Structure formats: structure tokens, C-alpha cells
Design a protein around this motif. Structure first.
Motif, mmCIF file in Angstrom:
data_model
loop_
_atom_site.group_PDB
_atom_site.id
_atom_site.type_symbol
_atom_site.label_atom_id
_atom_site.label_comp_id
_atom_site.label_asym_id
_atom_site.label_seq_id
_atom_site.Cartn_x
_atom_site.Cartn_y
_atom_site.Cartn_z
ATOM 1 N N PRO A 116 -20.233 22.255 11.214
ATOM 2 C CA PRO A 116 -21.155 21.824 10.152
ATOM 3 C C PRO A 116 -20.608 20.701 9.282
ATOM 4 N N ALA A 117 -21.466 20.057 8.501
ATOM 5 C CA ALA A 117 -20.992 19.219 7.411
ATOM 6 C C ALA A 117 -20.231 20.057 6.383
ATOM 7 N N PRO A 118 -19.147 19.534 5.807
ATOM 8 C CA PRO A 118 -18.404 20.299 4.797
ATOM 9 C C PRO A 118 -19.265 20.583 3.574
ATOM 10 N N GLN A 119 -19.015 21.727 2.935
ATOM 11 C CA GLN A 119 -19.770 22.115 1.752
ATOM 12 C C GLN A 119 -18.871 22.840 0.761
ATOM 13 N N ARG A 120 -19.189 22.670 -0.525
ATOM 14 C CA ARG A 120 -18.676 23.519 -1.601
ATOM 15 C C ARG A 120 -17.151 23.572 -1.636
ATOM 16 N N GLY A 121 -16.497 22.471 -1.271
ATOM 17 C CA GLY A 121 -15.054 22.433 -1.182
ATOM 18 C C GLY A 121 -14.471 22.816 0.158
ATOM 19 N N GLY A 122 -15.300 23.063 1.167
ATOM 20 C CA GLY A 122 -14.784 23.166 2.516
ATOM 21 C C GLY A 122 -14.111 21.883 2.963
ATOM 22 N N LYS A 123 -13.129 22.036 3.844
ATOM 23 C CA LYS A 123 -12.324 20.905 4.282
ATOM 24 C C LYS A 123 -13.172 19.913 5.067
ATOM 25 N N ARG A 124 -12.867 18.628 4.906
ATOM 26 C CA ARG A 124 -13.320 17.640 5.873
ATOM 27 C C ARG A 124 -12.811 18.014 7.260
ATOM 28 N N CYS A 125 -13.613 17.716 8.281
ATOM 29 C CA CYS A 125 -13.179 17.985 9.644
ATOM 30 C C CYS A 125 -11.869 17.257 9.924
ATOM 31 N N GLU A 126 -10.910 17.988 10.480
ATOM 32 C CA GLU A 126 -9.514 17.582 10.454
ATOM 33 C C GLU A 126 -9.269 16.365 11.349
ATOM 34 N N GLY A 127 -8.147 15.694 11.094
ATOM 35 C CA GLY A 127 -7.572 14.697 11.982
ATOM 36 C C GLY A 127 -8.350 13.392 12.095
ATOM 37 N N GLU A 128 -8.029 12.657 13.159
ATOM 38 C CA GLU A 128 -8.539 11.302 13.347
ATOM 39 C C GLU A 128 -10.022 11.318 13.688
#
Lengths: 50, 156, 49, 174, 222, 384, 37
Positions: E51-63
């Protein structure tokens, strides 16, 4: 239908055999001063004559 | 394993030879027919020769096909055919084996009118030319003459 | 000769499994010869395997 | 030469039919070999029949044939023999064994799993069969299952090629 | 696979302590590769959108992107070769037995060379010598391989025709007039400033050589 | 002829012609530069005589593309007949030498005017001939990756420049003979030789050897450098089935084309072209085979350099085979007396009988132009 | 004549054979057999 062709081709003993030929050439043409070394009644497709 | 067969063949097929391939079957009573075939290798597409053989107690379930590999039907070129499929097909069994083939077919007996010659002579020479079947081959033949140093001197 | 197809979406959450095989094999008659050869590994002791 | 003779087999199979007299023939030759024909030769042999019971044979002696060069022997080996290995040595009394040329050879049985065999009553007749005579060879399959073996099949091959083939039926004489 | 503090078969029910509900964020997969750019590099990207990050969830990791060369099968690759590890040899490889006893390559005469080098020559094969740029053949230029491996070695030798433009460690101290000179021609050894350090101010190739001062090719002072 | 190894392009020649989209970074140049060499390759003739396994490359499409290539490559000339990839970019001897090489090939359909070639060469030599080393690059330190290739370390890096420029000059020289340029060649060869004697890292040795194979093919030090190149070869099998060269720890893995695989493919293509200039078919064969495998799959770094030089080498090989193909109708006659004999020397009949030269006259031997190589001997017996 | 085995008998006889009867001639190869008769 891929079976009906391919496996019959690969393992024909596994299926009914119409083994005896069903298509033939005419008699081989004559040469001048020559003959076909083997006479025969039947000339199946792919048979050689000499 | 009562129903069984043997097809037996020369260790090596000679190209152009008329090769007699014999078959015996056991544990069969209904008379049936088989085909013994010589096919291109590995692709099995072209068939060089094929022989229908009928098996019955009238033949004591034994028969043979005479099969041959006429030399022009091989693709030839720089890579001659090393191997060919021998095949048998029946109502009951199908098998094929990679036979080797050899182009060594027949005999070329050179006869020179003498064993010793002076300079200032012409040699008379003739070649007896025989099939594997030991019949007169009726084939084009070529001679090559090599000096004692191993230098080619003439061809005819 | 191998024939394949791909999943367009997975099942999940208890949906119907894909049920059918993803790969089929058929015995061919090959065109080419194999170019394999055994490795001699020089001096090393070749196990029977 | 101090050991001027050499020895080789001729026409011997090195395969055993048990109990059948197994023939052996040797040709004595020279360096720049001719058929010497005049040499005494003798034979010593050891055998195995079953479970590796190593059994030595009594020695045997022949002259070479003056024309053929052949020294011939035949061994009435045990009906149960499995392998034989043997030596043949020049027995010319003027030559010691370091000089009387000698050789060693091994023969092995047909090693049927089914104990099923097909022996032929052939002595190895030394004399060439004349064209247009009838050859007669009696053939003796022996097997736990001979009642099954309705017929044996034969092939006569010349050079590269099968030339005759046929079938040879069991008589009521078994 | 469920975080500790959530359970049920697909992590559906929370423990009472579980916080920060509907925090999200995980990679989507990459695009197919771009067409090759001006520098013939392709690329692909993944959007952090499954999913798209929400509510302080991490950005999808890495490059978020990959970039790669563009490359193609130039030659007629008719089939994969069986190529092994550490397959190469240097010239250290043991010479073959040459048991056929074909003649080994002859040593050419002085100032000669072989036009057609090979490891082995067939019996009755002949090899041609030729002379170096400064040299001329005298004699019959072929050797012929005999059954014993000897060479029918011709009388041929390459005589000197010319002396090259000499090279010795100093730059200049020489004339540009020619790269090559007949025997007995002068060589001008011209100093840039009219002095002589060693040897003759002007010399000549005496047929064999100039016999020049090897250490210093007229290192005249300036 | 001996062993003939049928190394050929894939159907991918369509791509190598239709190459990655024309545009900036001179994607256009990088696309058309292979077009000229694909053209040259097909000018082996066979491949235009027979593509029939696949739909033909339309010859008129090729001729169009060639013409457009010439139109493009003119766009990269500087006013002073130097070359810059950008219209206002810094003039480069590197790109000038590349252009001169290309422009050597095209003349069969589209000759460039000899004056412009002479001007380019004159500018290059007159500005950048040097007393020791030569053709130092004038004003562009910035490399280009897919058009360019790795420079040397500073130690004898002139070797690369001297070699590269020499190559381009030699390929243009037959359309602008000028004695001062010849002199600059002689100088450049002397410097590059004297700097190759210490066996600089093997890529420099390979490119120098290729440059020298354009020069005096029998220069003693050239032949010594070739012997060094030959000692540095790698092979597989006791009789070599494959032959190639590695340096700089290129024995590392590379499942994709990269700068190190580029170095390998170019250095091997240079050793190939060197040995092709020595006509060394027997030595070339296992190189052709190793190239044909495309091991280090995808090739080089897919630079324009590695691909161009590989396809040039393969073209040369394809030429050499047909060159050695024997057909040579020799005729021999006395000078004042009549004709003596004729030999139809042919691959199928490669050796006619020796003939007694009976008559006391001068003997003249000749042949139709034909093809291949023969050797003819006369021997004399006299009682002394 | 003779042989260590059915397969060996056929090979030394200069034949080969196709059979399902639990034997094959692929056990043996064209050795340079050079005995004297």
C-alpha cells in the motif's frame, strides 16, 4: 487434440496401427536399354527402387 | 515377461550395403506385422529404408528385412553422418537404437604389372573393383602416386 | 519440450486455488546432439557419484 | 638369443563349456617368427568350480606338430568348473624354464544368471569345410526351463552380413 | 505473516494493546524497463504504492529505481557452450607428443623468417622463408618436410641489403633525410648546435654496422 | 584454404542497422556508425546474395541509411575539419580519427571529397605531431562512455592515442597521399614501437600490434611485439579450440557486458585484426570460434568500439576465406618457342603432374587472375 | 567364438541386438581386437 497427433506419433504401438501401406506410386518408368532391378506389385510412398 | 523380441543387426552398417536384419518374437500366437526402418539421426525425419515383415507360426514367428542406405540420400557435406537410427515398430513394441555407420564399402585391389621398375619406363596398372557383396562395383576410381619422400606426383 | 503459463493474480484469503499445473512437458524428438562431457577434475579423487 | 622362442594361442576361445573337453592350441614362433614345429610343450592348470574351491589339474604334455606348429591339448574339465587359469611352457629338455618360453592365460565361463546355456558339439574340427558339403552341428540347450525352449534359432554370418537365418525345433527326444 | 500483537489467520484481530491502527506502507513491484535512453541505458521504477504509506508508516524501503545497460545478441548464437570454471591455459600447456612425426617448425636462417608458421608441417609440406625489411634472399627459399622430420634445408640465407635509420638513446643528433640507407652511405649525425660529444661528426654504416659509440649518440653540448 | 569457420551475424543485424533510437548523446551517431560496418560486412556479398533463411534486408533501405549516415557524419565535422560531437563542442583528434576510419570504408558508394580528408589529416598532424609520442589529445579530457573506451593509466597512455590515430590515418591514407603525413606516420610508428618495447599492459600491446600490422608488416620489432602478443594468448584444449586474451583481473566473473568484458572483447578483436593482417588463418580460427560463442554474453560493454571492431574482424576473416579459395588457370610457354602447357589449378584438382621443360628457350609462366595461391618450381640437372 | 555373456557373444560375433529380454550391447565397444585365427 494435441494428444491425438503427438502421442500417436511418438508411441504408435500404444494405439491401433494401420501399419500396412495405403498410398502407392505407379509402376516405375522404364529406361532405354535398362530395367528396374527389383520387380514388385506394390510401391509404397518413400520406397526406393534401383 | 513371456512376450519378447530380438532384432539382430551388424555391429556397424556399411553405407550402400544391403544389410539383412532378422527378427524373432516369442510368446505370440496371433500373427502380426512389424516394420524395421533405418531413419536419420537424431531427428528420425528422413527414412533411408523400410521393410515390412510378417510374423506367424507359418514363419515360426521369424523373419528378416533387407534394408540399405543409398549413399546420396545421406546429407553428406563436410560432416558425414556418423550415426543412424535402426527402428522396429509393431502392435506390441516400438524401439530404436543408434547404430554406427561406416563408408568402408568394398575392395580396391591395385595390381601393378611389376614390383620393380627402372627409370625410363611406363607402369601399366589396373584396379580390381568389388562391392562389399563382392560383385564388380562399376564405380569411378582415382589413383594417387606418392614418391618415397611422401610427395604427391600424379593423380588420375 | 516445456510449455508454461503465468498467474494473473494469486488466490488469497481463502479464494479458489489455481488448481491447474503451471508447466507441461512433452517428449520431443530432438534436432541437435548433446554437447555434454564429463569433468576430469584433474588429480582430484572422483567419487563414484 | 638365449630365449629365442615365443608362444601364442591360436583359435582358442578362452571361454569354457564345463565337462565338454575344452580344446587348446598353441603356436611356437621365433624372433623373426617361423613355425618351429619341433618343440616339446607342457601345460599346468588351476581351476575353480563353485565357492572358489581352488582345484589344481594334473599337467599335460604335447609335441608341436612339425608342419602346423600346433601343439594341441584338450581338458576334460569338471562338469561344474567356473574358471580356469593355466600356464604353457616349452618343455625342450635342453632349455631351462628361464629359457624355455612360457606364458599364462585365463578363461571364464559364460556366467548365465538363469544357469541357462546353449552348448554346441563342435570339437573345433581343424580341417576346412569343403564347399557344398552339408555341415551338421547338433546343438544342446541346457536349462532349468528346457520344457519352455521350443526351438533355438541360428544365424550364419559372413564378413559384415547375415546370410542365413533359421529355426531348429525340439524333438520329442528332448 | 502477522506482527506480534495481531492474530487470526490473516492477522485480522488486534490485541488490546495494539496502537497506531491502519499504519501502512510496502513496495509495489517495478515497471517494465524503459526504452533505452540517449546513453542506451534502460530503467525501471517501483512506486511504494502497495500500500501507500499512511499515518507514519515507513516509505517502501530501498532503491526506488534500477538502471541497466542495453545489450543484444550480436552473433549467430546457435547453442549454449559447456564452459567451465578456470578453463583457460596459458602458453604453459604441455606440447603434444607429435607422434605422427610430422616435422616441427624449422628455425629460419639468420635474417630469415617463416611466412606461414605452424606447430607441425605435413610430410611433403613446404615452408617459405622471407627476409626482414632490410634483407634480401640468396638461395632457394623453401624447406620440404621429409618422412624422418628433417627439412631439406635449402642453402638460402638473407644478406643485408640496407642499414636502417639508426636509433640510439639520444633524441635528435640525426638527419630526417631517410628511414633507410644503402651500405656505405653516410649518416649525418648533425648536432643541433655544431658540437661533437663522441664518435665521428659524420659517419657511415660500414656494411656490417656503423660500429657507433653505443653509450652516447653525439650528445653535443648546447 | 583449410578449416573455414562460419562465424556470422544473427538476424539481429536488423537491430544493428535499425539501431537504438537516433538522438542526443549522438544516439544518432551511435546508431549509424554500425550501419557503415554492417554495409561493409554484407559487401562480403554472400549475405546480400543469400539471406533466404529470413526476409531480406532491403538493399535500397541500406543505401538510404548509408546516405543519411554520410549526411549525419558531415554534421559532426568542425569548420577546421577537426571533429566535435557537439556543434560548438571542443575539437577532438579522437573523434577525427574515428571519422577518418569510417570515411575510409564508405567510398565505394559515397566518396568524401579528398580535399576535406586532406584538411582533416593536415590539421591533426600539423597541430599534434610531437617529438616523442604523438597526437596528444588537444582539448577534451572528458571521455564518452559508449562512444569511447577506457584510456590507459598515464604511463605511455600516448600508446593508445598514437595507435588509434595511426589506425584512422592509415584507413584514410589511400584517399589523401601526402609525404608529410607519411613522415608523421613513420614518426608515430617509431614512438609507439619504442614505447611498446617494455610490454605495457596488454591492451596497449594489442592495439599497438594492430596499428603496426598496418605498417611495415616485416619490421623486426613489430614481429617481436607480435611474438609477445602470441605468448600472452590464452587457449582451451591442447590443440587450441578457443583462443582469447585476459588482463587486469578480467578473470573475475561478469554475467553481463561491462567495462572489463569490453576490454576483453576489444583486446581480442585487436589481436584478431593483427593476425588477419598477417593472413594467419590457422591462428585466427580458434579466435573466430571463441568470438562466435559470445561467452561473456551480450558482448563487451555493448560499446560501439567493441562491436565495431569485432564486426570488422569477422568481415576481414570472411574476406580472407574467399581470397584463399583456389582457382588459378596457369599457362606456361617458352619465350620465342611456343606454348608448353596449361594447368587448371583448382580446389578439386589442386596438383597437376610435373612437366619436363624440353626446349632450350626461356620459360615464361603466368595465370589468369583467378583466385588463391600456388607455388611453381623448376629444377635443373646437369652433369659436372 | 563364445563369450563372457550374451551381449559379449553378440559383440564378438560382430552383431548388435535390440531386445527387451534384459540385455543390451551398449555394455561394450569397438576395442582393437586383434587375436589370431
Amino acid at each position: 487434440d494435441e494428444e491425438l497427433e503427438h502421442l500417436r506419433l511418438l508411441e504408435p504401438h500404444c494405439f491401433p496401427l494401420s501399419l500396412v501401406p495405403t498410398e502407392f506410386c505407379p509402376s516405375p518408368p522404364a529406361l532405354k536399354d535398362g530395367f528396374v532391378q527389383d520387380e514388385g506389385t506394390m510401391f509404397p510412398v518413400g520406397k526406393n527402387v534401383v | 515377461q513371456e512376450q519378447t523380441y530380438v532384432i539382430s543387426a551388424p555391429k556397424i552398417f556399411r553405407v550402400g550395403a544391403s544389410e539383412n536384419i532378422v527378427i524373432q518374437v516369442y510368446g505370440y500366437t496371433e500373427a502380426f506385422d512389424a516394420t524395421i526402418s533405418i531413419k536419420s539421426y537424431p531427428d528420425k525425419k528422413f527414412s533411408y529404408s523400410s521393410g515390412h515383415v510378417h510374423l506367424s507360426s507359418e514363419n515360426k514367428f521369424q523373419n528378416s528385412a533387407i534394408l540399405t542406405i543409398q549413399p546420396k540420400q545421406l546429407p553428406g557435406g563436410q560432416n558425414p553422418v556418423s550415426y543412424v537410427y535402426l527402428e522396429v515398430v509393431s502392435k506390441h513394441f516400438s524401439k530404436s537404437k543408434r547404430m554406427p555407420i561406416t563408408y568402408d564399402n568394398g575392395f580396391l585391389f591395385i595390381h601393378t604389372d611389376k614390383p620393380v621398375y627402372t627409370p625410363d619406363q611406363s607402369v601399366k596398372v589396373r584396379v580390381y573393383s568389388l562391392n562389399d557383396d563382392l560383385k564388380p562395383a562399376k564405380r569411378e576410381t582415382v589413383l594417387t602416386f606418392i614418391d618415397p619422400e611422401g610427395s604427391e606426383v600424379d593423380m588420375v | 519440450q516445456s510449455k508454461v503459463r503465468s498467474v494473473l493474480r494469486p488466490s488469497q484469503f481463502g479464494g479458489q486455488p489455481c488448481t491447474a499445473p503451471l508447466v507441461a512437458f512433452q517428449p520431443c524428438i530432438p534436432s541437435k546432439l548433446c554437447k555434454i562431457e564429463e569433468a576430469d577434475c584433474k588429480n582430484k579423487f572422483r567419487c563414484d557419484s | 638369443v638365449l630365449s629365442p622362442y615365443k608362444l601364442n594361442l591360436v583359435a582358442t576361445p578362452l571361454f569354457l563349456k564345463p565337462g565338454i573337453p575344452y580344446p587348446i592350441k598353441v603356436q611356437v614362433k621365433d624372433s623373426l617368427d617361423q613355425l618351429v614345429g619341433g618343440v616339446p610343450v607342457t601345460l599346468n592348470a588351476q581351476t575353480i568350480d563353485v565357492n572358489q574351491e581352488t582345484s589344481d589339474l594334473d599337467p599335460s604334455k604335447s609335441v608341436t606338430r612339425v608342419d602346423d606348429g600346433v601343439a594341441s591339448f584338450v581338458l576334460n574339465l569338471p562338469s561344474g568348473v567356473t574358471v580356469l587359469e593355466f600356464n604353457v611352457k616349452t618343455d625342450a629338455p635342453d632349455l631351462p624354464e628361464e629359457n624355455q618360453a612360457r606364458e599364462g592365460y585365463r578363461a571364464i565361463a559364460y556366467s548365465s544368471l538363469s544357469q541357462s546355456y546353449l552348448y554346441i558339439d563342435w570339437t573345433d574340427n581343424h580341417k576346412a569345410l569343403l564347399v557344398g558339403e552339408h555341415l551338421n552341428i547338433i546343438v544342446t540347450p541346457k536349462s532349468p526351463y528346457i520344457d519352455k525352449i521350443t526351438h533355438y534359432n541360428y544365424l550364419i554370418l559372413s564378413k559384415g552380413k547375415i546370410i542365413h537365418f533359421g529355426t531348429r525345433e525340439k524333438f520329442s527326444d528332448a | 505473516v502477522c506482527q506480534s500483537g495481531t492474530y487470526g489467520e490473516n492477522c485480522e484481530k488486534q490485541s488490546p494493546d495494539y496502537k497506531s491502527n491502519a499504519v501502512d506502507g510496502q513496495w509495489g513491484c517495478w515497471s517494465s524497463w524503459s526504452t533505452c535512453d540517449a546513453t542506451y541505458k534502460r530503467s525501471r521504477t517501483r512506486e511504494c504504492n502497495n500500500p501507500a504509506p499512511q499515518r507514519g508508516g515507513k516509505r517502501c524501503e530501498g532503491e526506488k529505481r534500477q538502471e541497466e545497460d542495453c545489450t543484444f545478441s550480436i552473433m549467430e548464437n546457435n547453442g549454449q557452450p559447456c564452459i567451465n570454471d578456470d578453463e583457460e591455459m596459458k602458453e604453459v600447456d604441455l606440447p603434444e607428443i607429435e607422434a605422427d612425426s610430422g616435422c616441427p617448425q624449422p628455425v629460419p636462417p639468420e635474417n630469415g623468417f617463416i611466412r606461414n608458421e605452424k606447430q607441425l608441417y605435413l610430410v611433403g609440406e613446404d615452408v617459405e622463408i622471407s627476409c626482414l625489411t632490410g634483407f634480401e634472399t640468396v638461395g632457394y627459399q623453401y624447406f620440404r618436410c621429409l618422412p624422418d622430420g628433417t627439412w631439406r634445408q635449402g642453402d638460402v640465407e638473407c644478406q643485408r641489403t640496407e642499414c636502417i635509420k639508426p636509433v640510439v638513446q639520444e633524441v635528435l643528433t640525426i638527419t630526417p633525410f631517410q628511414r633507410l640507407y644503402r651500405i656505405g652511405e653516410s649518416i649525418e649525425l648533425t648536432c643541433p648546435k655544431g658540437f661533437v660529444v663522441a664518435g665521428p661528426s659524420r659517419y657511415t654504416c660500414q656494411g656490417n654496422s656503423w660500429t657507433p659509440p653505443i653509450s652516447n649518440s653525439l650528445t653535443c653540448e648546447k | 584454404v583449410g578449416e573455414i569457420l562460419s562465424a556470422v551475424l544473427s538476424q539481429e543485424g536488423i537491430n544493428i542497422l535499425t539501431h537504438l533510437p537516433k538522438g542526443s548523446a549522438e544516439a544518432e551517431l551511435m546508431s549509424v556508425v554500425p550501419v557503415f560496418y554492417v554495409f561493409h560486412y554484407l559487401e562480403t556479398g554472400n549475405h546480400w546474395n543469400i539471406f533466404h533463411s529470413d526476409p531480406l534486408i532491403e538493399k535500397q533501405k541500406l543505401k538510404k541509411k548509408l546516405k543519411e549516415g554520410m549526411l549525419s557524419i558531415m554534421s559532426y565535422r568542425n569548420a577546421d575539419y577537426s571533429y566535435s560531437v557537439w556543434k560548438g563542442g571542443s575539437a577532438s583528434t579522437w573523434l577525427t580519427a574515428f571519422a577518418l576510419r569510417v570515411l575510409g570504408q564508405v567510398n565505394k558508394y559515397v566518396e568524401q571529397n579528398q580535399n576535406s580528408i586532406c584538411n582533416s589529416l593536415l590539421w591533426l598532424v600539423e597541430n599534434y605531431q610531437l617529438d616523442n609520442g604523438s597526437f596528444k589529445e588537444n582539448s577534451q579530457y572528458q571521455p564518452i562512455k559508449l562512444q569511447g573506451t577506457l584510456p590507459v593509466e598515464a604511463r605511455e597512455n600516448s600508446l593508445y592515442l598514437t595507435a588509434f590515430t595511426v589506425i584512422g590515418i592509415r584507413k584514410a591514407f589511400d584517399i589523401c597521399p601526402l609525404v608529410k603525413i607519411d613522415t608523421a606516420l613513420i614518426k608515430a610508428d617509431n614512438f609507439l614501437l619504442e614505447n611498446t618495447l617494455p610490454a605495457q599492459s596488454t591492451f596497449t600491446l594489442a592495439i599497438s600490434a594492430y596499428a603496426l600490422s598496418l605498417g611495415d608488416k616485416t619490421h623486426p620489432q613489430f614481429r617481436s611485439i607480435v611474438s609477445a602478443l602470441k605468448r600472452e594468448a590464452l587457449v582451451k584444449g591442447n590443440p587450441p579450440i578457443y583462443r582469447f586474451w585476459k588482463d587486469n583481473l578480467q578473470h573475475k566473473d561478469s554475467s553481463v557486458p561491462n567495462t572489463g568484458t569490453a576490454r576483453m572483447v576489444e583486446t581480442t578483436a585487436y589481436a584478431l585484426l593483427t593476425s588477419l593482417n598477417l593472413k594467419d588463418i590457422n591462428y585466427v580460427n580458434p579466435v573466430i570460434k571463441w568470438l562466435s560463442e559470445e561467452q561473456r554474453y551480450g558482448g563487451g560493454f555493448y560499446s560501439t568500439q567493441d562491436t565495431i571492431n569485432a564486426i570488422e574482424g569477422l568481415t576481414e576473416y570472411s574476406l580472407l576465406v574467399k581470397q584463399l579459395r583456389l582457382s588459378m588457370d596457369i599457362d606456361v610457354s617458352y619465350k620465342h618457342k611456343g606454348a608448353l602447357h596449361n594447368y587448371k589449378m583448382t580446389d578439386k584438382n589442386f596438383l597437376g603432374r610435373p612437366v619436363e621443360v624440353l626446349l632450350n628457350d626461356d620459360l615464361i609462366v603466368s595465370t589468369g587472375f583467378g583466385s588463391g595461391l600456388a607455388t611453381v618450381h623448376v629444377t635443373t640437372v646437369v652433369h659436372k | 567364438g563364445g563369450g563372457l555373456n550374451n551381449a559379449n557373444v553378440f559383440h564378438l560375433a560382430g552383431l548388435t541386438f535390440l531386445t527387451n529380454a534384459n540385455a543390451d550391447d551398449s555394455q561394450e565397444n569397438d576395442e582393437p581386437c586383434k587375436e589370431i585365427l
